């Protein structure tokens, strides 16, 4: 574009102000604003086709050629190798929506792009970009209040989980896993409700292990109330099933003790050598005897062990797992109700965990084995074991189920619920239009633009569903204003009715509010930029 | 109008494979038979190789076409199963494919060609078995004749008079001739030593070692008691980290003295058994023979051979009845081997050899010392002697003998022509192709001998039709004759395996229709 | 563990104790105190909150926003 | 406007973003390329490919396995990578169907491109395909038959399934031979699914019919030097001890003394420790000792003096298979002999195969593991025979697990297509036009099977469709003469597991590739 | 569900043309009116030209986009037929296309836009004639 | 489209001579059907003029002149009737004058 400085002097002497000013570029003012708006519109029009049940996916290829098929706006924009700084800002915006909510990552981008596209026409008419940003802030406040007004509430109890299942089904309608729609919603709900702190209103996702294994069918995905590990029993002649398992969780390798300090044990005689030999033997025997006397029928170590320990476990009928990772050790403890023991001397019958079933699982013609721990009493940990025909659908299933879990988390944090299908956006657009009518200052135009931008989500849903955008949206808006019903939206699935409260299409109020707030704040930060400086090449 | 066959790449691929295979066959056709010559092969690194062996030639020339690679693998498989016929098998495969050429052109399906070839293969196995005659391993003249036949094709054929009786003695020494159903030629050790000529090749009934003797002055031992030592004659070293901390001046002299005494006690426990020859295994991580130990052994008049390899131990034990000792406590007289002589022999300034000859327990093992004026001729002598041993091995495995000089191939051509005339259909064309393909070995033998291939092969076919089924190409007279008077016989296993493996390779290559360039 | 030095010094100025290299004299004068301690989720991250310190001569801003540079310009403001 | 065709390009130099039609074009072309590649290997008259790597090793493989073919090609189309991974996952789940799932996915995607050209939304297409998948699932499951109860009929079904699995492969030359081999080898597992128990030894040389299934077991390990070579009524100790300069696991331990005499005493003590270990071993009353780890010269000598055959350096798989074949317990401690179970076999000798000697265990006790010696003329023949045997063994194991069987020769695909057709002609809208395409692909499967043989695929598939519309649910392709026949009589039966997996994985991959309307590539790492 | 519109290149081309035209219009928007200023244009040969004339400006800046070339031809035609308004005509064209942007996005067919524009044009000629005075 | 169907048939394993045979038979059938469906009105002057106007309208429908089709149809028909049966299309000169609307065009 334009250069930093183009004089070189009114006297002919060199004029060097900035380093590599000749290789550097600069864009200033309205042309800079329009470049920003063009970039943002490009990103938003890329994303808008991945919106809604009839939304399509994108195939992302990384540097090393790995393929990722997804409908998740945050994953798409993260996999996208963007160079434009405004596109980077939009990627950050979507990532922020994903961090805070875990859903809406495409709505935020579409809405921000629409806001900037309307600011484009407002700037053409000559309004100051800061005035545009302030009108957008005003309209965003109005829309947030209207969302709080039209919101509904759902019960987050563990007895009737139908509202939560409906919410999760709405969230998962747009993902490839809608083939197992209700199974996935059920397992997301049961997962969060099993592991969720109702009193604190907190949900720790480290306690939800989402594991995937190629093979089987997507319908085989299930919720394990317990843990799955990628290990097998240490000895090949151990039993592959253990019922009523009393579990000893240990972070001590079944090996002779060893000081952490630099140590040298000196052997100075045949008697010293034989004493050392007998010490080693008796250490192994004493370890196994302590584990047996604790009453355990199963051992789980974190640091692996050797041939003598393995065979002694086998002889003493103590199936054992080794080389289990720290996180899985923690999850097994939490699930079985056991305490992690750092050495055998500290092991007691009360520190043991209990699992009604510990089994080794095969996966066809593979030679790889997995260990399932389940039938615990009150497991505060849980595992989601995902199956499918390829790693692409497995990864998409993982991220979609993450979206569902995050949505249930947002419900546990705030039970208020708005109805989707663009209905909430149409209602907020109506409210913003009314407030713009009551506004007599120059921000009227910015607020009308905000309404026209809010209306892009119903239009996008209709377009992706093949309906005519303008016709469908105007008819449902007219119906909303005539018969007061903010649950009137786009019949994306062609169920006949436009009532999203009847179709059980459900969004989170904090989710929608976060969408609107993030889009408005980022659009403000973009409109406030009027000069770009970048290094050459 | 049947199926249009909208795709031509399958046929192009079949034709390319056939062309590559026929090219390999025609490249090595010149190294077939007594009148066939050798090829020199200079590797990219510059390793030169003169050879008449088909398997060696094909493995050494880095062929690139897939079909040629498969023919290489075929020759290796024939070298494994029979050790002789590695050129005939490749020629047969190439010829069968060259016939598939015209069959495909006629418009027969590759599956039909393969099945008809399997039929012809079964019939040919029948024919060869009918031709065969049984053999007793006691028939030393028959064994000698088989070995001479195997050697006639190789550079070592003026020395056949020397290397056939050796190749028969060696195999007959490493097997119980009454019960043996096979032989492990690792029991026969071959030692290539430059110098002299191939008429200097030797069959050592005892043991031969390239390791040098460490003692100076003690090179010859009569009435030798030999012990294998898998422990180290040097200062003690525990398997654990060990040190010797000195804190007083007296401990220095004490350390030196106790080291001397340890070594001396070791060598005295060795001498006490009557051992005068000591083979010490090779030891990394620890000195297997310290200077003190060598001094003491030499003073006690014991020959010492260290650096024995951990893979020659089982051989040395099998040979000279020794039992390997890994702890000095178990080194006694019952763990030794008695040999009438153990000598370090010099070969006219061309190196040295340790020969342990004479043995009270010479257990089914022999060694062959291969001499020669060049590295190339030595290597080819080794390969040819291996071919002779493998011929004797075929005779041991399958007690059946077949004539040579292209007689089996000609009988195959003839009887499979008859079979084809009897098997009217589209299989008839394929079986007739199989027959005319097997008619190529006699044609090649004639061409290489220098005769008119067409006239010679027609005379052969005519005489076999008359009934002289033991009639072949007499390269000594220059025409056809009863080949048993020339004593050209080979084990039935050679021809049978060659035919079988060539047919399997041809069927495999016919089942191929595409080539991909993976990554 | 591995708590940053500045956050430790702020926790000290807030709760009212002292940082100890030795655990041999852990008196109530050197221990700190707050009315509430919690670990909560804040936008994808987990944060430890010490709240209720009445003698606190320190405070901690927690800034939200939709981009790294958004939050950086907020911090500069 | 668009991400790529905008006044500003939003991408780093080297990236790209194919939009709707361009993306669907590259996806369909890649998938259909993969499918056209992997077909012509489909069915009894399918032909093999040469892989011919281009690395500095220039590996050479001759394969008929679609999974192997797809794994060994340099693919750069993302949809093609999807299909490749799908075939790999099929090969992991079951051992057969890796070419049929790929061909099915490719044909479905061809029909989907046709429908997109017909101006049908690639969500109406996926909807109709899901309905068709349901119909096909139900039709297949209703057509399945189970014979696991009847032992004789189950054995016959196993022989038929093995024969059908081998028909397509290089082993069809000796199919009646390798079928019996594979069935006996899978029955020797006694219900276990451990396919590692079935060891396959490829010995270059001999004919493909010289291959056999050892009545006992074979091991490619060596015997010690001064130790026996023949043992009758063998009592066997399978171990995982060190027996190789075996040091006390205390690692700070060091010998620090002031006398070479003391160093020698400690060395003798180490030797005595090894001797006592060997003596504890011998107190089990054994004649054979197998160790997963090495056996050094001193314990070798001790076992020789004791008259015990000591096999060393077997591996984890070696000792597992030996425990399965003999009944022993893999041990590392010998202080409780009463608790260590020993293995038994009537005889242990050394046999020759090709030019190599192997330990032969005859008269074994359990036999729950197997050894198969594969002989052949070329290493390519041997590798393809191993791959084909692995296919057959995996399928027979999966059938022993789930005895449900399903007739082959296109009968199953035609039945599913018949059900999909009923659903289609009873359903309104363009979902019917997509179900009809689903059925067209299902029919195109046996169409390709017949094409590869050389028959009038159109006529034969028309006859099959007519038969399955009339109600001859057991009609299938008779590939001997080239007609239609009764699969129940001809013995052409497949595993319901494998057919269901083919169907479902193909439909799933086609769905996941069809949902794509944009391909955003990132700058290659180069 | 109507017609899927399996192809997006038509829409991309429409949007690119509209963008190019709007860019030309916005580039020459500053040379409109009594308070508008002139542009200097240095040809590749170095021939300098200061001007406020829309036709001259557009002919002298070697526009490359097809739509921009067509706007140049439009301004030349206006210069022929009237000799005045060569900037207003280009600005009007660019603005009408900038409106076609949002219409297309709303999902109206270009043919419907064209016909409705013809209707509006006839009505506007009527209106201007009513405004006129002899 | 014919070549697309031909690729489909080749994939169906049909010889591209059986295809040409069937295509020639189909061309004959289509020729005969077309020729039988054709109608002539050259005798009736009024109906022939109407057919000329309809043909001009149909030819212009696809083109940019469909905007002023009722105008350019009359233009083209009058211009072709002014030739009085001759087929010399060079006799019809077309002068393109930049400016004015497309409906300002005339004959
Ligand atoms: N079954 C449905 N019917 C109508 N609208 C739906 C349905 N499911 C989801 N939507 C709407 O689609 C919009 C886009 O959500 P989606 O794209 O699936 O998640 P994200 O926006 O987080 O990627 C939401 O605003 C929601 O209201
Ligand atoms: N003295 C001989 N007279 C005639 N034929 C011979 C004689 N010696 C060998 N042959 C023939 O030569 C062939 C062996 O040639 P050789 O070079 O060893 O080929 P290959 O390696 O395939 O055995 C045999 O078929 C045998 O019949
Ligand atoms: N003897 C036979 N007769 C008829 N059809 C057969 C026969 N053997 C196999 N098939 C068919 O061939 C297909 C198996 O071909 P194969 O090359 O194994 O493909 P995949 O690798 O996908 O299993 C099956 O669909 C089966 O119906
Ligand atoms: N003194 C004036 N006061 C207000 N408007 C004016 C005046 N002079 C010209 N204009 C307006 O400016 C326009 C002419 O600008 P000009 O640079 O000639 O553009 P164009 O070449 O497109 O006509 C006319 O529309 C006219 O209404
Ligand atoms: Mg969502
Ligand atoms: Mg020979
Ligand atoms: Mg198969
Ligand atoms: Mg003017
Ligand atoms: Mg026309």
Residue numbers in the entry:
A (entry chain E): 2 to 538
B (entry chain D): 21 to 539
C (entry chain H): 312 to 388
D (entry chain B): 2 to 527
E (entry chain d): 21 to 154
F (entry chain b): 108 to 214
Authors' description from the paper:
Particles in the most abundant class (29.7% total closed particles) were refined to generate a 3.0-Å reconstruction, where we identified the additional density as tubulin (left). Thus, the tubulin density likely reflects a mixture of different tubulin forms, including α-, β-, and γ-tubulin (sharing 31–41% sequence identity), although several isoforms of β-tubulin were among the most enriched peptides from affinity purification. We therefore built our model on the basis of tubulin β-2A chain (TUBB2A), the highest enriched tubulin peptide. A tubulin monomer comprises the N-terminal nucleotide-binding domain, taxol-binding domain (TBD), and C-terminal domain. We traced the N- and C-terminal domains of β-tubulin, which adopt a nearly completely folded conformation (inset). The TBD, however, is not visible in the density, likely reflecting its unfolded state inside TRiC. Tubulin is localized at the inner walls of one cavity, to the level of apical domains. The N- and C-terminal domains of tubulin interact mainly with CCT3 and CCT6, and partly with CCT8 and CCT1, involving residues that are highly conserved across tubulin isoforms and different orthologs. Of note, the CCT3/6/8 subunits constitute the hemisphere identified with low ATP binding and hydrolysis rates. At a lower isosurface threshold, the largely disordered TBD is seen to extend into the cavity center, toward the other hemisphere (CCT4/2/5/7) that exhibits strong ATP binding and hydrolysis, with potential interactions with the C termini of CCT1 and CCT2. Altogether, for the first time, a tubulin folding intermediate is observed in atomic details inside the TRiC chamber, where nearly folded regions are held by interactions with the TRiC inner walls, facilitating unfolded regions to attain native structure in the central space.
The chaperonin TCP-1 ring complex (TRiC) acts as obligate folder for >10% of cytosolic proteins, including he cytoskeletal proteins actin and tubulin. Eight paralogous subunits (CCT1–CCT8) assemble into a hexadecamer of two back-to-back rings, enclosing a folding chamber. This architecture facilitates nascent protein recognition at the apical domain with a built-in lid, as well as binding and hydrolysis of ATP in the equatorial and intermediate domains to drive lid closure for open-and-close conformational transition. We trapped endogenous human TRiC with substrates (actin, tubulin) and cochaperone (PhLP2A) at different folding stages, for structure determination by cryo-EM.
